[PDB]
Amino acid sequence: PVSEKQLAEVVANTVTPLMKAQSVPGMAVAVIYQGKPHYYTFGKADIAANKPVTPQTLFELGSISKTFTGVLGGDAIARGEISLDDPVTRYWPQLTGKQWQGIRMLDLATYTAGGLPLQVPDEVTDNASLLRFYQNWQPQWKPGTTRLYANASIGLFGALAVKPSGMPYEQAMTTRVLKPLKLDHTWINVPKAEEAHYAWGYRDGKAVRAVRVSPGMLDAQAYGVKTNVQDMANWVMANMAPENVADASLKQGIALAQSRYWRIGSMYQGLGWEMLNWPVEANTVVEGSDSKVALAPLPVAEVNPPAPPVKASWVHKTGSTGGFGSYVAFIPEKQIGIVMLANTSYPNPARVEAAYHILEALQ
Numbered sequence: 001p002v003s004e005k006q007l008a009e010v011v012a013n014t015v016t017p018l019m020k021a022q023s024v025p026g027m028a029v030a031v032i033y034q035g036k037p038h039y040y041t042f043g044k045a046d047i048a049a050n051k052p053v054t055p056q057t058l059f060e061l062g063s064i065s066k067t068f069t070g071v072l073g074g075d076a077i078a079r080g081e082i083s084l085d086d087p088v089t090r091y092w093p094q095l096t097g098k099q100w101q102g103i104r105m106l107d108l109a110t111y112t113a114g115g116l117p118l119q120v121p122d123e124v125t126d127n128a129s130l131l132r133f134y135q136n137w138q139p140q141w142k143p144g145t146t147r148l149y150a151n152a153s154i155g156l157f158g159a160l161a162v163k164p165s166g167m168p169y170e171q172a173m174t175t176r177v178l179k180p181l182k183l184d185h186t187w188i189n190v191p192k193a194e195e196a197h198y199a200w201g202y203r204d205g206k207a208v209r210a211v212r213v214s215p216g217m218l219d220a221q222a223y224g225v226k227t228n229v230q231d232m233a234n235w236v237m238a239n240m241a242p243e244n245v246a247d248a249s250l251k252q253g254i255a256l257a258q259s260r261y262w263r264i265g266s267m268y269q270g271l272g273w274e275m276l277n278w279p280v281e282a283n284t285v286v287e288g289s290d291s292k293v294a295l296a297p298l299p300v301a302e303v304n305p306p307a308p309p310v311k312a313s314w315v316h317k318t319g320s321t322g323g324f325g326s327y328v329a330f331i332p333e334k335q336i337g338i339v340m341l342a343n344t345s346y347p348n349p350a351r352v353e354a355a356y357h358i359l360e361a362l363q
């Protein structure tokens, strides 16, 4: 098997050319191998201040936030608070438009409601205006027919999924997912004392960080998760090996998020997480990551009933913000995984290629 020495070489020999080519100021990587995380840090968290990346540097996860949403929703299912087969309207009775009949919580969670757009528009500034948006929405497709990746879909799922708990999303997430997993440096809102750890993002040479949206059902979730490479490694480990998670509903929620709900070409949609059967070749995964494909409306095949987690899977998620680019992938059958956090948003295919190359060294 590969030694720790060899693994360190593989990671450096992969990441250093990638950062040069993609002009990445700083990256934190964790590889999960032989039951533990291995950490590698590169470059700068803050160029002007000459602060290096460390295992405590906070990065913006962007859309990898959706994996936390998915698990939180799974946990709520396992508690009996929601069911994926319930109508959206069960959790939002004020949503009276008849276009919503036949749209399930599952459809919101997995982007199959029938054309909810990528973004919630900026006109949406509060709950009254969020309601007007969803009430006015005209589906382009029937439910359960077309996948269109969308913050307006899973964001609403997250907001509604926590309603029975009585907690807002940020508090539900922290209480039910983060704290039990000891992810104690994972934030929506970075506390003031934690600010020294927060990297700057870089976009066309400008230092940038995430903004917020207007207050409401989606605020905390849109502001997106920030975390360091250690917490993210432990997040990957929990999702790779939920058998080691003691809380019964959270263990089940992790499994629900890695279940297969829909097939779309060579991939399968989970709750937040996406999956391909393992073995998979690099070009399959890399080509599917291009935004011309990843953001396209594509036909789905229902997996009814949902398939529970398949150990021989490539499980992954990309996520970006204006200044950050991150990627996570793991293969439960092999008990290997990787986290790559960077403070520039560089092309998703390049992230997948590097992650694949590193994990390939370990099988």
Ligand SMILES: *C(=O)C1=CN=C(C(=O)O)CS[C@H]1c1cn2c(n1)COCC2
Binding pocket: 061, 062, 063, 064, 118, 119, 151, 318, 319, 320, 321, 322, 323, 345
């Ligand atoms: C997730 O990583 C993600 C979410 N969705 C959108 C979007 O709502 O516009 C686009 S794909 C991706 C994303 C979001 N941002 C970027 N990429 C780049 O920085 C701006 C925010």
